[PDB]
Design a protein around this motif. Structure first.
Motif: not given
Length: 100
Positions: A97-98, A20-22, A77-80, A4-6
């Motif tokens: 997201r990697d 997150n665990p990721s 790709h980062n979301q804030y 899953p995403d970080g």
């Protein structure tokens, strides 16, 4: 993908509230060592900086926000996402997201 995403809950001054665990495994630490820390104490400092500038902006304008950075050998790709837009304008979720 398999991870899953970080996700990391942050302060606008850079404090990790949560991980997150990721995100933790990516950072190669466990959340307990992670949660007190400054984001830039914990990954590429320069990149932590920009990521934080992004979430600052998100929080200011009350709006979700995206950025791509290249950290490590990898792309993200980062979301804030400001939490509690009006009242809590101090914190956000960074979804990462990697995309390598």
């Amino acid at each position: 993908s398999d991870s899953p995403d970080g996700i990391v809950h942050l302060t606008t001054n850079g404090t990790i509230l949560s991980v997150n665990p990721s995100m933790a495994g990516r950072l190669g630490a466990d959340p307990d060592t992670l949660v007190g820390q400054q984001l830039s104490a914990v990954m590429d400092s320069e990149a932590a900086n920009q990521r934080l500038e992004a979430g600052k902006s998100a929080v200011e304008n009350g709006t979700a926000t995206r950025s791509e950075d290249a950290v490590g050998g990898r792309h993200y790709h980062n979301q804030y996402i400001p939490v509690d837009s009006h009242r809590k304008s101090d914190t956000f979720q960074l979804v990462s997201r990697d995309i390598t």
